[PDB]
Design an enzyme around this catalytic site. Structure first.
Site, PDB file in Angstrom:
ATOM      1  N   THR C  87      44.578  39.000  47.254  1.00 27.28           N
ATOM      2  CA  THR C  87      43.482  38.860  46.273  1.00 27.28           C
ATOM      3  C   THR C  87      43.631  37.595  45.420  1.00 27.28           C
ATOM      4  O   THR C  87      42.660  36.870  45.207  1.00 27.28           O
ATOM      5  CB  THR C  87      43.405  40.081  45.338  1.00 27.28           C
ATOM      6  OG1 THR C  87      44.647  40.227  44.636  1.00 27.28           O
ATOM      7  CG2 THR C  87      43.126  41.347  46.135  1.00 27.28           C
ATOM      8  N   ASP C 358      48.060  49.292  49.942  1.00 23.69           N
ATOM      9  CA  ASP C 358      47.857  48.032  50.672  1.00 23.69           C
ATOM     10  C   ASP C 358      48.660  47.952  51.965  1.00 23.69           C
ATOM     11  O   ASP C 358      48.099  47.721  53.027  1.00 23.69           O
ATOM     12  CB  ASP C 358      48.213  46.843  49.778  1.00 23.69           C
ATOM     13  CG  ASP C 358      47.232  46.594  48.640  1.00 23.69           C
ATOM     14  OD1 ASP C 358      46.164  47.158  48.669  1.00 23.69           O
ATOM     15  OD2 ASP C 358      47.613  45.972  47.678  1.00 23.69           O
TER      16      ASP C 358
END
Lengths: 491, 491, 491, 491
Positions: C87, C358
């Site tokens: 990100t 994740d």
């Protein structure tokens, strides 16, 4: 953070702030100290004017803001819960004790030393009080009237202190039951203007300030069958309300005490059944009546039976100073008595009522605890003498606080004589000299003549418990303050 | 964006701001550190005055605004959840650890080095604590009273620390069940003024501060059949309400504990059936009673059966300091006990209640974990010694942070002696010298006499878990802060 | 038009304004870049403190106002929807890419040239990534743990990255079903403090943080018949409510999960029928239970039949760190599994929960797409090398933008090393030299030792998809900005 | 009268004010002119960000205040209602036409002359457009893809303009019915991210973004009998609701589309009857389904009969990019088709959706009207040539306005080349020279290579109607303004 006008102190300033807060109250109460001391007039927002000398009462009624003064109030409330009297003395002793503590802090004496020295001297102080304590007969008429009169004196009503002591000593012995414990709740304090203070009398029964709800109803009932209802005598329709009245009649009850109201319609039928009734009876009154008559307070009439009725030999409506009151007397085994206080004015007997509320307490304490001590500051002097000697043996920094602890007791002999208008220095010298030579049973100050006198000979004594509680509460509340060094307050 | 008066810091100023926020609390609590430390008086907007020394309690009651101080509070709450005691010590250690970290940042030591060095030294610190840990018998009376007394001392109540240790050690062993796990929830903390601290006793049963709702009801019940209803005993009409009472009677129940109220009408019928009842019972009380008696708490009377009744050999109304309370005792297999704390004042036994809430905890920890260590800063010194040697082997920039980590432990030996009024420098030299030569089992500072002493010989010890949790929480909360370099706050 | 304090930019100032808005976020996230990067503490108006390193999470929680930063957020949300991880990297790449675009605009390169050059170089960049992509076995244990660990490292929890990789790789292969597609929704992330990170385990069944609603109910059920009701078990009158309970019994159900509450009256009858029940069940929990047991969630009891019951071999109430939870296991064909995350603190396992959310994703991506690439900036360097050569063949003004596009990739090798505290210039020279000679499978920077290393040998790899999505999203979001030259905002 | 800040103009100032108001929009849109033009980002008060190049859409979304700009918007809305595309071109032409009119007013040309000259030249301009119009086959695949691609080009999606042209040309010919009229309402624009632009396909049936309301219901229905109810499937009590479901079953219906919700209780019974259902169906969806299946939308179930059911060969639940959608296909005579647009991002296919909404329109126009013309400004040049000759024959003051009218057309060749970054003067000379010699079928500017080119050879053409409507709307809206010389506005 805080309203413009509000101030904050911190660290050493928080300490001085707290001592000053304690000084404000302590200074306020020490002007009321003694039989020759003054009183305070507290006037609220509604116009209610309350004039008294009681310390905790002053502290409860006035508006105190600072947490320090609010914890002082908690001490004053402990004094009331335990002793009742000596509300001023306790604060004054603690006040000077705090002043001496602040002087020690000024002298660079670590708070841990001040605490240790005080707690040490207070432990010996109570041992010394128990050492000098004079044992008396629990039911000795003489000492019973001496304890009573000690509290009574310094009041306008002392003109009849012999009558007052008589009423209280008899009332206490009446309700003590076993040997023994005195429950103040067994003695009612009733006050009606008319006559004078000499006329006050103890009535072995229950007197309430109620009349016979209807002029048609009997004005007295003999061999009375008392009914206690907390449900109002109010029912729509006269047929059902009549049945209710018939149900009360069915119980065999002749006297009816209703905690709530009685409808005028019911008052008619109640009179027709020959039932005498009093409405709007106080919750307290319903309980005192149950205690005396053995009557059982009933919620629902459905639950009321003949077995729930209490007995009284005579329930009679009598007038006093014109006012109609009900006298419930000649009960089989009354567990409640009523003290009827007379006097020339309502406001005078308002003061008498409080005065005897204490007197009846301290006499009970004297019966329960057979140790009493001389007044007039004799004990406080004895303690100053012996604790000064103890201080020398203790030594170190602790001896500094211990010396100050003992010296703190001198605020009472001093402020007492100060309110008397006597020489603060000379009085203290002549009292301490007379105490040192003659003893504690041959000492104290008589502010009534303004000279050192034998307080014990003159019947100026107080319960040991009073004296030891004063030390206990004062010492632990001083240490309480000393333990706090940081005040964290919300906005 | 923000209210005029509010300030913002960023980058390196955000770091210093955060350290300062941690310093505000750390400085506030380090004045309460030790048996000779002070306490704080927190006074809210409603007038509630709370005086304590407990760190997390102070942090919960006070108004903390900064996120940094709020995460410090979370650490203090972890200390409570795990250990209970040592709430001050944990913050003080973390406080100096943060100060040392900021000094490293000032010395141009990259935050990644400070983190690495701390996490490294903390890993060895816990290994060292487990290395020096002294194994004791889980049920050894002696060490059980030593752990207890360690927490107790430095309090006014320590005058009876022998009685207090006795009550707590017995209570823990009583409720431990198997060998073992101690559940604090099995011991109730009940406090009533009257008597002194020596009088405190453990009652193997359930004591509640309730009376018999009616004077007509029996004052005791033998071979008691306890019923637990959470539904109020309130029903319109006496016919249906009577049937309800008859249904309770039908169960065979003799004692009724209602969580909600009981209507006066029902109280009459309950008395007629010989059923003793207590209303407005606390949710906690309903649960403790179920635990002891095996009584089943019933919602609807429809669900109540005879099989839902609990047993007690005797349920009796007894007076203590005048107050009527119910003692539920002689139960077949009571799973709850009650500790009745006595003392001269409510506010004194309020402090005792909290003191023993901890003491009963740490004794349980000592039983569950058979490793304890010496107090008086001996462990912290040992760690300073060995970690300094480790630092030399580690080397690089990491050695800078590792050296500071070990040195940070010296804030406890120092501030302890500082609150004791001892020489900060000389004490640390004499303690470290005595520790280095004699060992860890022959060290620590005795602030009670103000000299280096054998803490282990004097019974000044604490659970290993306490010491290792202090390191764990402090190190990870320091790293937590170190990991954050940017504060993003909403308006 | 606008509030005093609000500013407006237009034309070329609107362009710089937009780049600056992108710079604010890009600069904020690039400090979190890498395993040695920092994190952000976001604190809202309610006091909620959220500490994370996730870019989109920071962007979702913080208050972003400018439309330019809000469209950047949309890019960050795409990164989450597609990859989850990376990100920060995505924003940083786009950030510098925008900076290079603004430099081109400063160099008087028409926006149509900047767009063309970027779109051209991005088309070849993805071809180059597919060219250097290294093919791996979809179910190769080794690469599966390498992908996982790459994401895991740089966290305090990496001390147990071997245990974490083990749990995630097994969980993914468990739920993958066919060969294949991994649905994250089949793996539950459950976290409970207690134990450490090594203790985390995968439970092939459904674990919920619920207890048995009554102490009277069985603590386990074997050959369990699970019923799922979303209608609360609440009915006026015990006759109808009893019939309801009898109807549940009639189904053959032994375990009841109610989405809504269960009335205490019903809890009594449920216990009498031997039915174990849990109320207030989360909507998610009702679905996971249906998936595992094959139980059919019923609205109305009328619709509930025996055919709607799900199966579990054992449904049992177990305590973990003291807390009662329900384990639903031994189901015939469970389509849901639960990962039970352990650790020393709630806030630590809060970070682990996100970390593995994740990790379980990117492992699934590695299975679905059998191409992975080396990390440590090796790909970004390869692209800088080849695109510079391509730029020369392209020529014209387009070559200016194409050269800048390739050079923009250097912000990652640089800022990574910058956060590592390494020489920005020398590192880039030594990495590019090592890459150029040895190759892409023999390059990248290891910030963990602070030296150029073989990232592939060290297992520092990431899915091709991650790398190609980063290019796709960054290039199209840069062109998006470049396409807009006029901002029309409402008041 | 008016808010402080508001200004008023009158007479000749009202004229200039109006031209300036027209200049504000005209200047705003002329920057978006052409395939190499820019776009606008409109951001409202709620945060909604809309990025587009469409003129009327910009004018609808933005906040326009002046009546002059509001009547310009009405012109832009006419452009949409008639053509769709060319929203920018129309305003730009009218903008310069107004500028030329104001120059004439400055040159002391009476408004009656400006009006006459414009209306005169516009009459010949349309005759000239019809004269140069090139006739093409209404169903010629080639010109059909040329018209389509003309609109498509200058977009990121042009990479697949061959696929897009294919889908639109087939869709138009599919729904044209007779020979002919194309109704856009027969083609649905559906867009789902996933895949790329090449993957977009035309589905001869109805696709809705709905799933099967229960997991218990069949996932497909063959020989489907479709029922359309706009009344929610919600009925108190399961007996009546069951009868409702039985009534739906009674119809022979197998597929149920409810415009409103379906109660969970009904969803159970619907599944038991083997009825597949979708709730909350859009009003548009209910209509498209009726069109395709021939299903009759029923208000009250009482009105629903077997004759009201529509037919579909297969109604099946299929997943696309994970999302469950319903495909209604193989209908006997479907009167609706669905275009399923694919692409890498939602925001990309949002632009494609609008792009093809136009493309499908202009292809339909090309079929309905078999005249098309060359683009690249070739027509506008032809008109400048011939109208200049006409102006000379007209003479008088009228010739002044007629000359300006023809010259006004040069803003398009110019601003187009200006947005392309080409020489405004030289381009116009080289284009007009090439046009004059080679013709209109051998002219126009190719901004894609930045040179004069044969627009017709390159397939750069547009419908005659587009070109003639541009003249019609622009001329009459210019005259509209010219007719008004006094603005009377309310407060």
């Amino acid at each position: 953070v805080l309203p413009e006008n509000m101030k904050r102190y911190m660290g050493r300033d928080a300490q001085r702030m707290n001592i000053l807060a304690g000084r404000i109250i302590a200074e306020t109460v020490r002007s009321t100290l003694g039989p020759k001391g003054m009183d305070k007039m507290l006037v609220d927002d509604l116009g209610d004017v309350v004039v008294t000398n009681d310390g905790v009462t002053i502290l409860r009624e006035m508006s105190v803001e600072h947490p320090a003064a609010k914890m002082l109030i908690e001490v004053a409330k402990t004094q009331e819960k335990e002793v009742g009297d000596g509300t001023t003395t306790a604060v004054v002793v603690a006040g000077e004790l705090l002043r001496k503590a602040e002087e020690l802090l000024d002298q660079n004496v670590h708070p841990t030393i001040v605490v240790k020295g005080y707690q040490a001297a207070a432990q010996k102080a109570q041992e010394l009080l128990k050492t000098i304590a004079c044992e008396v007969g629990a039911q000795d008429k003489e000492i019973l009237t001496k304890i009573a009169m000690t509290s009574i004196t310094g009041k306008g009503a002392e003109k009849a202190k012999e009558k007052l002591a008589e009423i209280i000593v008899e009332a206490v012995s009446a309700v003590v039951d076993d040997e023994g414990k005195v429950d103040k709740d067994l003695i009612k304090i009733e006050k009606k203007s008319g006559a004078s203070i000499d006329d006050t009398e103890l009535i072995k029964g229950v007197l309430v300030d109620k009349e016979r709800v209807s002029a048609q109803m009997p004005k007295k009932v003999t061999d009375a069958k008392i009914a206690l209802l907390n449900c109002a005598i109010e029912e729509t329709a006269s047929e059902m309300l009549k049945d209710m009245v018939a149900e009360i009649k069915a119980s065999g009850a002749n006297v009816l005490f209703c905690q709530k109201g009685i409808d005028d319609l019911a008052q008619h039928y109640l009179a027709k059944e020959g039932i005498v009734a009093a409405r709007r009876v106080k919750k307290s009154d319903m309980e005192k009546l149950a205690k005396a008559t053995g009557a059982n307070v009933i919620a629902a009439i459905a639950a009321l039976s003949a077995q729930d009725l209490g007995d009284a030999g005579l329930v009679e409506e009598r007038k006093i100073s014109g006012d109609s009151m009900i006298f419930v007397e000649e009960c089989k085994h009354p567990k409640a008595v009523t003290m009827l206080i007379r006097g020339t004015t309502e406001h005078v007997i308002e003061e008498v009522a409080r005065a005897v509320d204490d007197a009846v307490g301290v006499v009970g304490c004297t019966i329960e605890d057979g140790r009493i001590v001389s007044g007039g500051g004799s004990t406080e002097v004895e303690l100053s003498m012996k604790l000064r000697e103890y201080a020398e043996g203790i030594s170190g920094r602790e001896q500094l606080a211990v010396r100050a602890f003992a010296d703190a007791l001198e605020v009472i002999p001093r402020t007492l004589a100060e309110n008397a208008g006597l020489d603060a220095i000379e009085i203290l010298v002549k009292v301490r000299a007379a105490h040192a030579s003659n003893g504690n049973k041959c000492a104290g100050l008589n502010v009534f003549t303004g000279a050192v006198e034998d307080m014990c000979e003159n019947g100026v004594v107080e319960p040991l418990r009073v004296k030891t509680q004063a030390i206990q509460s004062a010492a632990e509340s001083t240490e309480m303050l000393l333990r706090i060094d940081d005040v964290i307050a919300a906005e």
